[PDB]
């Protein structure tokens, strides 16, 4: 038996299918037992049994190609994926993580670890484009799935693979982390739109770690502030967790609970 898997297809995707998919993903990410100021906390990496460490997301498209992404439950972030007979992993940041990912796709005949990490800075560099310039929506995700699949046949060049990772991470991992970002993807489906993320989304993505800390270290929710951006790119400060309730869906574990 196995890590949990959640399925989603871009083919005939609707606001409802996407929403229910993201909700299912969150359910496999947090236990529901650690909630702080109403925001769920992800499992603490320290002491976490390896059989609890990962979940799989099976993505398919209208071209009928499928890939499975692996997400780390401790951060909701993509550590690698499988297509056909091969799995591909980002370079791990430490030896524990390096050891953890060896328990993924153990079924697969070929397992490759990239020489680079999966952080946006590295991926933007490999892609030769910023998040600001990379459109998101069902169309881009449909195409990103094909690109990841054909990486495994040699049909996808590295910069396109980087760009496709940038799309997948945002529409899956960041959507899972932030209701606000799930909402941004919902709207794109509703209107059949593809468009790049605006500054509001980019700053939340960049800030997810800092927000997790501020929230967990707050006095009854009051921060010891975090600067975000509005959609027009103007700066605003968050002082308190209350405003973030509709915004941030889960947090990386920082400190012991109340």
């Amino acid at each position, epitope marked *: 038996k196995q890590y949990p898997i959640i399925n989603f297809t871009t083919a005939g995707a609707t606001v409802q299918s996407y929403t229910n998919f993201i909700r299912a993903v969150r359910g496999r990410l947090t236990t529901g037992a650690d909630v702080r100021h109403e925001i769920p906390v992800l499992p603490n990496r320290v002491g976490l049994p390896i059989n609890q460490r990962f979940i799989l997301v099976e993505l398919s498209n209208h071209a009928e190609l499928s890939v499975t992404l692996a997400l780390d439950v401790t951060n909701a972030y993509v550590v690698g994926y499988r297509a056909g007979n091969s799995a591909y992993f980002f370079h791990p940041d430490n030896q524990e993580d390096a050891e953890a990912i060896t328990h993924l796709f153990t079924d697969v005949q070929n397992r490759y670890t990239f020489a680079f990490g999966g952080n946006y800075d590295r991926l933007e560099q490999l892609a030769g484009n910023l998040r600001e310039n990379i459109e998101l929506g069902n169309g881009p995700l449909e195409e990103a799935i094909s690109a990841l699949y054909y990486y495994s046949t040699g049909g996808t060049q590295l910069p396109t693979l980087a760009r496709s990772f940038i799309i997948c991470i945002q529409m899956i991992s960041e959507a899972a982390r932030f209701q606000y970002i799930e909402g941004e993807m919902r709207t794109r489906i509703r209107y059949n739109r593809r468009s790049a993320p605006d500054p509001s989304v980019i700053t939340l993505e960049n800030s997810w770690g800092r927000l997790s800390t501020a929230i967990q270290e707050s006095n009854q929710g009051a921060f010891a502030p975090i600067q975000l951006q*509005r959609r*027009n790119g*103007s700066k*605003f*400060s968050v*002082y*308190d967790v*209350s*405003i*973030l*309730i*509709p*915004i941030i869906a889960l947090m990386v574990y920082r400190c012991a609970p109340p």
Partner: nanobody
Amino acid sequence: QVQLVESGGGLVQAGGSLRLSCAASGSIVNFETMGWYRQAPGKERELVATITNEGSSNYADSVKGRFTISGDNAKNTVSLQMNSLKPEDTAVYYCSATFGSRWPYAHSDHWGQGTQVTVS
């Protein structure tokens, strides 16, 4: 629990100058737009000067180059410097503030109760 506090106004000589100030409390977030509208008696209320969170200002054509608005986002305050006062400027001035999304609101808008400026 938004509250606007307006200061300034009163009787002033033609050619003089004064300052209006407005400070919003009870907004957990900074204003989207803040500024003044005025209503001259027998007239419709009209925009005078507003400023945005981006610090962009908008003025009535008739006060442009006479009035200056400035703002402080972090304190949710705006100030209107009124120079070269003219008869047309006699009116009740109303502070207005609008705020964008913060839970549980998508937005809100707020009016002051007005302060009269009378040019003698």
